[PDB]
């Protein structure tokens, strides 16, 4: 199973994106070794995927689990909101923490600019493309409200993980 982690500042749509992905892609699978014989699973681009959201503020200011999410995750959606400059400024620290915890210079990641439906844009596409280029990763704009780009962001992350697992 591919282990995907959605990371970013609070209030940017991480939960909204993940819920929309599950809604579109969950299936009920027959498994007679499980108690009730059926389990829900998310399948993305033919791969069974596990999904987790990493917040560090709010209730998660009190959590002991940040580094554990980073060690377990195999690929990361690094999310900001296009109407939240601070959330964009927060990206670098998240990426640096992931790289430090995983002790790897090759961590599958996709940069995601959410809320692209909103007219109040303070982070330009070019700013985000430049950041993604520096990191060597894809950038995609999404809206959980209108659904634009949501599947594409996760499908792209799955391909990034697949390439990493190949070699
Ligand atoms: N306009 C708009 N609002 C969104 C979008 N995604 C999330 N929201 C709203 O942003 C707020 C925070 O979303 P949430 O999923 O709780 O963010 P989280 O803290 O990152 O998990 C909620 O009121 C959502 O309805 C989006 O793409 N567009």
What count of helical segments does DSSP give? 6
CATH-defined fold name? Rossmann fold
Q: Provide the CATH top-level class.
A: Alpha Beta
Number of strands: 7
SSE order, one letter for each helix or strand: EHEEEHEHHEHEH
Q: Which CATH architecture would you pick?
A: 3-Layer(aba) Sandwich
* Residues in β-strands, percent: 25-35%
Q: What is the assembly state of the chains in this entry?
A: monomer
Sheet with the most strands? 7 strands, mixed
Structure class: alpha/beta
Number of domains: 1
Helix content: 25-40%
The end-to-end distance, rounded to whole angstroms, is 17 Å
* Radius of gyration over all CA atoms, rounded: 16 Å
- Overall geometry: globular
The set of bound ligands, ions and cofactors reads: guanosine-5'-diphosphate
Strand order in the largest sheet: 2-3-4-1-5-6-7
Can you identify the CATH superfamily?
A: P-loop containing nucleotide triphosphate hydrolases
Binding site for GTP: 8-16, 27-33, 57-58, 114-117
Pfam family, one: Ras
InterPro entries: P-loop_NTPase (IPR027417), Small_GTP-bd (IPR005225), Small_GTPase (IPR001806), Small_GTPase_Ras-type (IPR020849)
Protein name: GTPase KRas
């Amino acid at each position: 199973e591919y282990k995907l982690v959605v990371v970013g500042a609070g209030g940017i749509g991480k939960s909204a994106l993940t819920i929309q992905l599950i809604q579109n892609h969950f299936v009920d699978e027959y498994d007679p070794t499980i108690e009730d014989s059926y389990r829900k699973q998310v399948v993305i681009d033919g791969e069974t995927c596990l999904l987790d959201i990493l917040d560090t503020a709010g209730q998660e200011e009190y959590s002991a689990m940040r580094d554990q999410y980073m060690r377990t995750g195999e690929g990361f959606l690094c999310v900001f909101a296009i109407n939240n400059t601070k959330s964009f400024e927060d990206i670098h620290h998240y990426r640096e923490q992931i790289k430090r915890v995983k002790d790897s210079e090759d961590v599958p990641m996709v940069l995601v600019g959410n809320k692209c439906d909103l007219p109040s844009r303070t982070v330009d596409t070019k700013q985000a493309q430049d950041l993604a280029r520096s990191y060597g990763i894809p950038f995609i704009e999404t809206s959980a409200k209108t659904r634009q780009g949501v599947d594409d962001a996760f499908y792209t992350l799955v391909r990034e993980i697949r390439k990493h697992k190949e070699k």
